[PDB]
């Protein structure tokens, strides 16, 4: 379908363009979800410590390795450093906890989950008595240096960023003494948040973009009935019908044809399989431009409790 399965990263490794998301996947369902995904062809799993389900994801990965359904070198496992671990002295331990839970001896890619550092401690969103999230002082260039050390210690093959705006990406690229460029910026992207400016910037610097919430995250916990709904948009349904595919399949193919990686989440076996069957059709340029035209700057993930943080990413235009 004029579509290779992997994209070359600036660390020299190849990354599967379609992965399985795991945010909100219940711990009692995610082991089967990941097993099914690997069985039906997925080779990339997107994880995070803050999702609280890495142990269960890891059970699935380990079983499929033990069963010899896949070899470790064929898998591309991604996780993310949570905001309460931006300190120099906490990054390695946070990575190692993720490795121990996923039952891996390296990650293919480790991302700074958000540019905002928070006070370390047990709470993922530490609050002051008035409800503000308590920041860390550690600046993100120092967090990046700590990520670089993980490459040099063999814990991770690639490092990257997530939810960074273009000025924050530029800060990393302009870092004095930069040793490794970010390989990936993982950002929200779908027809209602098309991200042209940030995607162009990242791609022009050789940074691969991964699109999260490609279906508009209908299970996001703050969903309101009045919100827009990609899967129910009749205009997108019409493009899907024309191609004899589902709306979800169109929504997944869309970022693929922008040279993005995409990570739809499901715990439903039939949908996991459906979502992978996107290498057998092509959207036209006109389809692509039409889908881009639906942009409304609508965000699933605004980190809305953190808008006063000095490194909050979404005040900038892009
Ligand atoms: N870096 C970040 O800050 C960040 C933020 C958000 C997301 N992410 C990553 O991106 C992944 C994907 O984003 P997301 O989880 O927000 O949402 P999403 O992938 O846009 O949507 C997931 C929702 O769509 C449903 N669904 C999946 N396939 C479907 C299909 N074929 N037909 C109908 N409904 C379908 C799922 O239901 P069922 O599961 O019940 O089947 C679930 O409710 C996350 O899981 C996470 O790995 C990263």
Swiss-Prot record:
NADP(+) binds at residues 12-21, 213-275. Highly expressed in embryonic epithelial cells (EUE) in response to osmotic stress. Substrate binds at residue 113. It catalyses: an alditol + NADP(+) = an aldose + NADPH + H(+); all-trans-retinol + NADP(+) = all-trans-retinal + NADPH + H(+); 9-cis-retinol + NADP(+) = 9-cis-retinal + NADPH + H(+); 13-cis-retinol + NADP(+) = 13-cis-retinal + NADPH + H(+). Changing residue 46 to N: Reduced glyceraldehyde oxidoreductase activity. Its EC number is 1.1.1.21, 1.1.1.300, 1.1.1.372, 1.1.1.54. The modification Phosphoserine is found at residue 5. The modification N-acetylalanine is found at residue 4. GO terms for molecular function: aldose reductase (NADPH) activity; all-trans-retinol dehydrogenase (NADP+) activity; allyl-alcohol dehydrogenase activity; electron transfer activity; glyceraldehyde oxidoreductase activity; glycerol dehydrogenase (NADP+) activity; L-glucuronate reductase activity; prostaglandin H2 endoperoxidase reductase activity. The keyword Metal-binding does not apply. Cys-301 may regulate the kinetic and inhibition properties of the enzyme, but does not participate in catalysis. Tolrestat inhibits retinal reduction. Keywords: Acetylation, Cytoplasm, Lipid metabolism, NADP, Oxidoreductase, Phosphoprotein. The keyword Lipid metabolism applies. The record marks 80 as: Lowers pKa of active site Tyr. It is an enzyme of class 1 (oxidoreductase). The active site is at 51 (proton donor). It comes from the Eukaryota. GO terms for cellular component: cytosol; extracellular exosome; extracellular space; mitochondrion; nucleoplasm. One of its GO terms (biological process) is daunorubicin metabolic process. The modification N6-acetyllysine is found at residues 97, 224, 265. Belongs to the aldo/keto reductase family. Catalyzes the NADPH-dependent reduction of a wide variety of carbonyl-containing compounds to their corresponding alcohols. Displays enzymatic activity towards endogenous metabolites such as aromatic and aliphatic aldehydes, ketones, monosacharides, bile acids and xenobiotics substrates. Key enzyme in the polyol pathway, catalyzes reduction of glucose to sorbitol during hyperglycemia. Reduces steroids and their derivatives and prostaglandins. Displays low enzymatic activity toward all-trans-retinal, 9-cis-retinal, and 13-cis-retinal. Monomer. This is Aldo-keto reductase family 1 member B1. It comes from Homo sapiens.
